Design a protein around this ligand. Structure first.
Ligand SMILES: CCCCCCCC/C=C\CCCCCCCC(=O)O[C@H](COC(=O)CCCCCCC/C=C/CCCCCCCC)COP(=O)(O)OCCN
Lengths: 261, 258, 98, 258, 262, 95
């Protein structure tokens, strides 16, 4: 089945973000909703969790509706999403060991000798077991997203939403974050919705792809079917060039009044 | 002009009305609900350090500077009639009516008022409030509620430290320096002050000023835009709106009680 | 409800039935002193979902048995246990593969 | 002895180089080649966000402090026949201690926090590092017009705070409670004198303008280029200026007023 | 000939070390790409060439003349021939894009107002930002902020443009623009460009001599085509996007039997 | 280094180098050189930057007001390699 929205239309006070988009991914399959910068890629994952209410549309999640349930029903569905963010979403007043155990200290009923053994093996999967006593201010940009990935798998979720991972990192730790999703899906099994813009780093493990252009879904498919697709808007994003639908220049006058008046 | 001036003034009238509407819904969704006295008990003492303990340095060393200035200016104009039995009145009476809860509130809005705005605004830019509501209880009753109750306790408590140091600070320019027979300084200063006029009435102004300062300090950090310039813009508006709420309510409480 | 354990003790056989969730571990956490008293046979055959919560108590029933010098093994364990050992990088002498 | 008990370190070497960094920041921004026509549009542009934009929190707050000075100056002079000396308390308080001290706390809150946020955002976006690369000094480009703007604004904003606060006492003293205008202004015009009330109000307004602007321009220059270093230096600007204005208020009153 | 040649400097910042012994030569009229992992001093490496900071050991020269061993007035004379740009797109907030590009050549050169208006529109047309000259820099995006700084960098006709990690987090539409902008300015103007970004498959198509900076040393000095055939574990792990190698990713600290099951 | 023009009335023989600091004797004294020439000579120049290109296009546009067709002869390779970079259209710089 599908766990994302069906047909929504998000519109702000001045500009528009989405206009009759559709998302469909099977359970346990990694999808990749790609798109250029400037558009609302961050606010796309907020409609699934229920942070903001859309104007016209509905989000189907296992036969339910996100903007139609109450406040007590929204907290039950939110216990199995654990949306990962772009920057480091770690609390500065606590260390790494208390950040991962923070969903475990208010939802689970595990005792103190049992909770110490659960966090210590969750950090071993992301490779941050020795940095459990360090501060989040001492961590770098690559280790901050890996510490939030262990916090995301604390309550055993069913739909992990990655909000622009490895956006400005070196290719040494960029391949680690790609490899961390492959071990969290082939060994456990979880649907991953990853939004990004880089082509050759997300079309390796994801089985489905989505292209958003001009506030609409222009194409879809797989990692191999998206290469052989004749389209002026699709072939500009993949294998990025200067020409295409982007006119490469700002809309100006006659080039005779500003220059040489 | 009629369709342009009314539209520009009408656009700012709704945005002003929507500003107070978001501040009322933020305080109402942070005080009522289920009782969590066992969970907020380690969270209240943690927020009592950066509000009450860290703001004690700006009050103690400045408390001896208020009484030394007020004790020196209030002496040379009282020598024309009687040098003895002076400086007990006009120093302790002034530090319990106008000075005191007003002067400590400008030090609370500058030190603790600007820090609580920059703390919530930094967590909004790093996506900490949105990440807490996506997995657990929403941060309206988790990080805003212990920060609101910490301001209405520390500022009535820090005003008593500002009064007792400033009274002793006024007793340094009168005793052991141009002395005025300090046996006359006591047993007549106590006859001027009394309960429900100077002692309890000082505590009335401290609770009222603690609410209107911490409300704007927790709303500007919550309504700021998540960027590097929106936190610095809301930090400037916290000191502005609290100075007009302390000096503005100073005329309100003086004409009502005194 | 499906969240239950219902452990049975036949002297030297511990057949952990039901479902190893993150909330039914409390009856077995307080009664863990009798499940390491000379057993050498840990059976997990009637389970279907063993997450990282139930795997933490599964390592506790082996380590407390090693203090008394036991030879506990895994008899007919589910395939979801072994695929989580390579993810969390479990070493030797705490969870036997055979 | 070698550990943190006695020779704890990082307190004599540290927080002393920052005094040397603040001295080299002002000496290299004020001593140089005379550029009068170059800094002439820069002084007018940096006078709007320093002197003009800070005039809002002084006019509406000058009548707030000016009215409570007349409310508290009435009931304390009932049994002393000092009703004709109603301007004796309002004018003398707003020209000696109130005025240049209270406006400096509003200058450090609005203009002091904005000058720290302006230079702090330039170093975070590397605007001062890119300005330095194109064969010009960033010290005498943005710091030097901001220093001379804040120096000449605070005595020009104190006289607005005095005249509004005196008029604020006239609306509560002459209009209300029935005091004669001939008896009110006779206690202000030919009662107080020159060189004690007028010159000394402008002497301490210049020294308070130098100290506040030097602190606000140093915390914005010596800061960490990140999102948390600008908010930390904005909080430290109000703390370091409130202890310098109130700290020098006891120092400056040693010569004048007896 | 060469321009800088990067003599042996250390720049020890008190607590931690930045460089041990580096040799990153810059030939004239080429594209010198210095790629490396994050967390090291790649931003402060360009500050040693411009003369904003001074190293501890050794020296650094620029076109024969030494940078630390010169006067303050002579350092400002040779610093206008570089005109480097930054990652965040350092533009002035009080003025728009038109007076941003017209800023360095107003106080240095003596061109009149009709000749100045016919000069900014030349540089804004090469980057494609002519119609946005009357627009604020605050409402601009992250992609167009780097193109406005590139037109400002070519105002005084420099010789060594130092790109402080461009297109680090941009969309591939904008990433295809800034690659073509260096290829059309290096051949026409004849200006040396230095890129210190870590995007390996993007800057290698335009560079003429790549440089790998890892572990505060120079482990590779090959070209753009000879870098793919370098048998070294520290170079092969940085390229091609792999996870494991000489750089530890598991963070080895403490015994696993001590933390687990206490 | 100087920008002395050998204007005899039919050639406008511009000599020297076109830099961003020697345009002052030619920009102010420009009204007495577009008096029906239909010719601009650029054979004795080698460094034509974007500052000197703005003064070059000013001499052609003032010739179009009086009806003069400018034919550039002996031009350097630096002028043509900057017209395609700055996207110079037709009828302002004859190729
Ligand atoms: C013999 C009985 C005398 C009267 C006893 C009762 C007096 C009660 C007064 C206290 C209650 C009213 C308080 C009003 C507010 C006073 C505050 C004040 O005066 O300003 C102080 C400092 O004091 C001054 O401003 C100096 C005042 C100088 C007064 C000069 C003499 C005034 C003459 C009035 C009496 C007339 C004398 C002539 C004889 C006739 C009457 C006997 C502020 O200090 P800062 O450090 O600047 O605060 C910074 C943070 N806001």
């Amino acid at each position: 089945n599908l766990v994302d929205m069906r047909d929504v239309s998000f519109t702000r006070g001045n500009r528009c973000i989405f206009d009759n988009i559709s998302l469909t991914v099977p359970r346990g399959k990694i999808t990749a909703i790609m798109g250029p910068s400037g558009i609302g890629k961050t606010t796309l994952l907020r409609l699934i969790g229920g942070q903001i209410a859309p104007d016209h549309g509905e989000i189907l999640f296992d036969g339910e509706n996100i903007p139609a349930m109450s406040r007590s029903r929204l907290y039950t569905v939110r216990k199995r999403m654990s949306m990962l963010f772009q920057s480091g979403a770690l609390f500065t007043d606590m260390n790494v060991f208390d950040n991962v155990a923070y969903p475990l200290r208010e939802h689970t009923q595990l005792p103190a000798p049992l909770l110490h053994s659960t966090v210590m093996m969750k950090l071993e999967a992301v490779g941050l077991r020795g940095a459990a006593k360090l501060m989040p201010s001492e961590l770098s940009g690559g280790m901050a997203r890996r510490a939030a990935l262990a916090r995301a798998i604390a309550l055993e979720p069913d739909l992990i939403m990655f909000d622009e991972p490895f956006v400005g990192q070196d290719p040494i730790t960029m391949g680690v974050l790609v490899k961390l999703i492959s071990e969290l899906n082939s060994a456990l099994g979880v649907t991953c919705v990853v939004v990004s813009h880089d082509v050759p780093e997300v079309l390796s493990i994801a089985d489905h792809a989505w292209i958003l252009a001009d506030k609409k879904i222009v194409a879809h498919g797989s990692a191999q079917a998206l290469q052989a697709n004749p389209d002026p808007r699709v072939r500009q994003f993949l294998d990025g060039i200067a020409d295409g639908p982007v006119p490469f220049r700002y809309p100006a006058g006659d080039y005779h009044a500003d220059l040489l008046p | 002009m009629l369709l342009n001036a009314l539209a520009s003034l009408g656009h700012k009238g709704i945005k002003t009305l929507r500003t107070f509407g978001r501040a009322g819904l933020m305080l109402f969704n942070a005080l009522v609900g289920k009782p969590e006295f066992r969970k907020h008990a380690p969270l209240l003492v943690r927020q009592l350090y950066n509000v009450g303990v860290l703001s004690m340095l700006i009050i103690v060393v400045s408390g001896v500077f208020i009484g030394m200035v007020l004790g020196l200016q209030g002496y040379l104009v009282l020598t024309t009639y009687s040098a003895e039995t002076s400086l007990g009145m006009l120093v302790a009476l002034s530090l319990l009516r106008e000075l005191g809860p007003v002067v400590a509130a400008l030090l609370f809005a500058g030190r603790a008022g600007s820090a609580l705005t920059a703390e919530i605004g930094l967590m909004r830019a790093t996506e900490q409030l949105s990440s807490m509501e996506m997995m657990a209880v929403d941060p309206l009753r988790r990080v805003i509620s212990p920060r609101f109750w910490a301001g209405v306790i520390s500022l009535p408590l820090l005003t008593v430290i500002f009064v007792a140091v400033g009274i002793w600070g006024g007793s340094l320019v009168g005793v052991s320096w141009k002395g005025i027979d300090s046996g006359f300084f006591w047993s007549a200063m106590q006859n001027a002050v009394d309960w429900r006029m100077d002692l309890v009435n000082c505590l009335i102004k401290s609770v009222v000023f603690a609410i209107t300062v911490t409300w704007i300090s927790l709303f500007n950090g919550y309504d700021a835009i998540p960027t590097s310039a929106g936190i610095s813009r809301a930090t400037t508006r916290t000191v502005v709106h609290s100075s007009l709420a302390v000096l503005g309510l100073d005329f309100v409480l003086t004409a009502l009680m005194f | 409800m499906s969240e239950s354990l219902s452990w049975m003790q036949t002297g030297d056989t511990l057949a952990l039935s039901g479902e190893l969730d993150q909330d039914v571990l409390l009856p077995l956490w307080e009664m863990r002193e009798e499940a390491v008293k000379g057993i050498t046979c840990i059976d997990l055959s009637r389970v279907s979902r063993v997450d990282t919560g139930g795997l933490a108590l599964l390592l506790h029933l082996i380590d407390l048995a090693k203090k008394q010098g036991n030879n506990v093994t895994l008899q007919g364990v589910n395939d979801k246990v072994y695929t989580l050992a390579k993810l969390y990088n479990l070493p030797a002498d705490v969870l036997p593969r055979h």
